[PDB]
Amino acid sequence: GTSKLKYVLQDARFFLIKSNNHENVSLAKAKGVWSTLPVNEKKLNLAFRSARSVILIFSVRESGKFQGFARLSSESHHGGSPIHWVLMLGGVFKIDWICRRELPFTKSAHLTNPWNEHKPVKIGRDGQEIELECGTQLCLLFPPDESIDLYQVIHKM
C-alpha cells in the first residue's frame, strides 16, 4: 500500500541529491548516512528544523535514474567514524531510507520543478529543492520497496 508513504510525505520538503558515483549511494544505503558540501549542509539543517520530513532523492550522475529516497533523521554532526566516500565535506546526516529502488528518468518526464525554472525534475544541481507537489508525485512514481516498514519512520515525525 501507499498510505503510510503518503503520510510520511505530507507537508515534507524535498531535495535533489546528485552523486558522482554509485559507491557513495551504496555506502549511504548500507550505513544510513549522507554528507554534502557546506552550502547544502546549511540548507538541509535549516530544512530539518522547518518541516515534519525532509526527503533526499538520490541520482547518480550519468546513470539516467534516481536510486531511491530517504528521510533526514538528524541535523548534521561531526566526530563519527570516518566514512570512506569516493571523492572539504561537512558533517554527517543520519537518514532513514524510504525506498531503495531505482526510477528511470523516462518515467518522470511529465514532472517539472517550479524551483528550477520548470525544468524536468531530473535536472538540477546537487541540493536543489523540489517543490512539494512535484516532489510528492516523484516519490510516488518509485516502485514500492516492500523491504521497508514505514511504521518506524512515522514515529520519528
UniProtKB/Swiss-Prot annotation:
Residue positions where Phosphoserine is found in the record: 81
YTH domain sequence ranges: 12-142
Consequence of substituting residue 34 to D: Abolishes RNA-binding and ability to influence alternative splice site selection
Effect ascribed to mutating residue 88 to A: Reduced binding to N6-methyladenosine (m6A)-containing RNAs
Summary of subunit composition and partner proteins: Interacts with SRSF1. Interacts with SRSF2. Interacts with SRSF3. Interacts with SRSF7. Interacts with SRSF10. Interacts with CPSF6. Interacts with KHDRBS1/SAM68. Interacts with TRA2B. Interacts with KHDRBS3. Interacts with EMD. Interacts with RBMX. Interacts with ZCCHC8.
Superkingdom assignment: Eukaryota
Consequence the record notes for mutating residue 24 to D: Abolished binding to N6-methyladenosine (m6A)-containing RNAs
Function: Regulator of alternative splicing that specifically recognizes and binds N6-methyladenosine (m6A)-containing RNAs. M6A is a modification present at internal sites of mRNAs and some non-coding RNAs and plays a role in the efficiency of mRNA splicing, processing and stability. Acts as a key regulator of exon-inclusion or exon-skipping during alternative splicing via interaction with mRNA splicing factors SRSF3 and SRSF10.
Subcellular localization, as worded in the UniProt entry: Nucleus; Nucleus speckle
Organism: Homo sapiens (Human)
Domain notes: The YTH domain mediates RNA-binding.
Protein name per Swiss-Prot or TrEMBL: YTH domain-containing protein 1
Binding-site positions, RNA: 18-20, 34-35, 85, 126
Included range, full protein: 345 to 507 of 727
Variant or mutagenesis effect after changing residue 97 to D: Does not affect ability to influence alternative splice site selection
Record-annotated membrane-spanning stretches: none
Post-translational modification as stated in the protein's UniProt record: Tyrosine phosphorylated.
Result after altering residue 125 to A: Reduced binding affinity for N6-methyladenosine (m6A)-containing RNAs by 100-fold
